[PDB]
Structure formats: structure tokens, C-alpha cells
Structure 1
């Protein structure tokens, strides 16, 4: 067949009841994740190929970067809670991987301040129990699939994207193939 279990995707052996339809995991420490966001724009190209209004969910992970990796999962929970993901994704990736100016939780906060989130608003969110619940949710979703690498994308708790089965000689063709595979899976 054109799409085959074990080629463009693999099938979870213990599927996850009630999972987000389209669930992406990343780390701001992850070099391929930087490529996925800043160079390939995977999440945006996937969204443009799914029906209007569908739920794409994107969660950060703890297992890269030690202490700061866990701070970034909490900061990502702040970003989700305040709805400022689009304002802080680029400066966080660049601050960790390009300029290497993010070295502490305070440096992460500066990214939000510079992006126009008020200090009191950031700190209140950082310390909130709503943000604790969002951290818990990110952790649980990664645990549900025994996640040990990023970037990763899951469709309906059932299918995991397998980009290692895709020609990457042309960036645009690769992104298309990835997006079309998500569409195909979501229609399964």
C-alpha cells in the first residue's frame, strides 16, 4: 500500500484512550525540534491540511536539559495558559539553541517580559495551580506513550509519525509528506 504500518508511521501497541486527536511533543533543547519549528514549520503545515477547527495539541517534555528542561515545561504551561505560544516559541528556541542566553528560570521569564507579558501576570501564572495542572497534563500525555524521543507526533492515541521513512533532500517535499500522512492517519 502507499501508506504502510511500519513505514510512514507505526502503530501503538497499547493505544491511549481519550487522547488529543493530533498531539505533538517537543523540547526547546531538541535540535530536530528547532528545525521542525523554525525551518520546516511542521505544526503549521499539518494544521493547514486538517479540517477547520481540529484540535492540535503541543506539549513540552522534561527528559532533555535537566533542571532547565523542567523549567521550560512549566514555562510552556504558562504559555498555554496565557495563550502566548506564538509569541514565545521562537525566542525560547533561539534563546536555548542559537544565542544560548537562556540559562536559568529568570532568563526564561525575561523572554516572556520582552514579548510583552507583564511581570505580575507571568509570576501569577507560573505559581498557579492551573499551571501545575497543565504541567501534570503534559507529563501524563508523554507517560501514556512511554515517550523517550522528540520531536514526536501521535494521531488519535493510536499512530506515531515515522519521519525516518521519508526523503529529506527537499525540505518542502518532506513537510508535505509528513502533513499528508497526518491527514491520512486522522481519517483512519
Structure 2
């Protein structure tokens, strides 16, 4: 067929009940994730093609970058809680991988301050149990699929995107193939 299990996607042998409809994982340490988000704009182009009533969830992971990797999962929880993902995603990626100016939790915080989140607001969120809960939700979702690599995207707890089964000669074509595959999977 045009879409084939093992080609554009794979099928989880242990399906996850109650999983987010479309679930993306990344790390700000992850070089391919930098490409996915900053250059390919995968999340945006996937979202722009999702059926009505299909929501997209994006979570950070701990298994890259040690201590700072865990700090970034907590900062991503702050970003989600405050709803400022679209303000901090670029400077966090660039801070970690382009300028390499993010070396500590304080450096992460500076990115939010520069993006206009007030210091008191950031610190209250950082220390909040709402954010602890969001951190737990990120960890649980990744654990549910035994996640050991990023970038990764899952659909309905059942299917995992397989971008290695896609032509990478043209960036634009690759992105819409990925997006069309997520749409196809969500409609299964």
C-alpha cells in the first residue's frame, strides 16, 4: 500500500491506552530535534494538517544532557504552564546548540526573562507543584513508550513515525510527507 507499517511508521507492540492523540518528544540537546524544529518546522506543519478535534502535545525528555537536560524538562513544564512555548523554543534551542550560552538553570531562566516572562512569574512557576505535575506527565508519557531516542512522534499510543523511511533530498517535500503520514495515522 502507499502507507506501510515498517515504512513511514511502525506499530507499537505494546499499545498505550489513553495516550495523547499526537505526541511529540524532543530534547533541546538533540541535534536532529534542532533541525526538526528550527529548520524543518515539523511540529508546525504537522499541526497545520491535523484533522479537526485532534490536538498536539509536545514534551521534553531527560535522557540527554544530564543535569541540565532535567532542568530543561522542568523549564519546558514552565513554558507549558505559562503558555509561552512559542516565545522560548527558538532561544532555548539556540542557547543550547548554537551559541552554547545555556550551561546552568540560571542561564535557562535568563532566556525566559529576555523573552519577557517576569522573574517572579518564572520563579513561582518553576517552584510550583503544577509544574512538578507537568514534569511527571512528561516523564510518564516517555516511559509509557520506553522512549530512548528523539525526535520521536507517536499517534494515538499506537503508531510511531519513521522518518528514516522518507527522501531527504528536498526539505519541503520531506516535511509534508511527514505531516501527511501523521494525518493518515490519526485518521486510522
Q: Taking structure 2 as the reference length, what is the TM-score of the superposition?
A: 0.99
Q: 1:53–1:118: structure 2 CA closer, same or farther, 3 Å change rule?
A: farther
Structure 1: runs of 5+ lacking an equivalent: none
55-64 or 44-53, which moves further after superposition? 44-53
Aligned-partner Cα distance in 1 for 2:110–2:54: 32
Query: Following TM superposition, by how much is the alpha carbon of 1:52 offset from its aligned partner in structure 2, in angstroms?
Result: 3.7
Aligned-partner Cα distance in 2 for 1:151–1:84: 21
Query: Following TM superposition, by how much is the alpha carbon of 1:55 offset from its aligned partner in structure 2, in angstroms?
Result: 1.0
Query: Following TM superposition, by how much is the alpha carbon of 1:63 offset from its aligned partner in structure 2, in angstroms?
Result: 0.2
Write the deviation string for residues 66-89 of structure 1: whole angstroms up to 9, x where unpaired.
000000000000000000000000
Tell me the residue number matched to 1:50.
Answer: 50
Query: Following TM superposition, by how much is the alpha carbon of 1:51 offset from its aligned partner in structure 2, in angstroms?
Result: 2.2
Aligned-partner Cα distance in 1 for 2:53–2:118: 30
Aligned-partner Cα distance in 1 for 2:52–2:77: 25
Q: Taking structure 1 as the reference length, what is the TM-score of the superposition?
A: 0.99
43-52 or 69-78, which moves further after superposition? 43-52
51-60 or 62-71, which moves further after superposition? 51-60
CA RMSD of aligned residues (A): 0.6
Structure 2: runs of 5+ lacking an equivalent: none
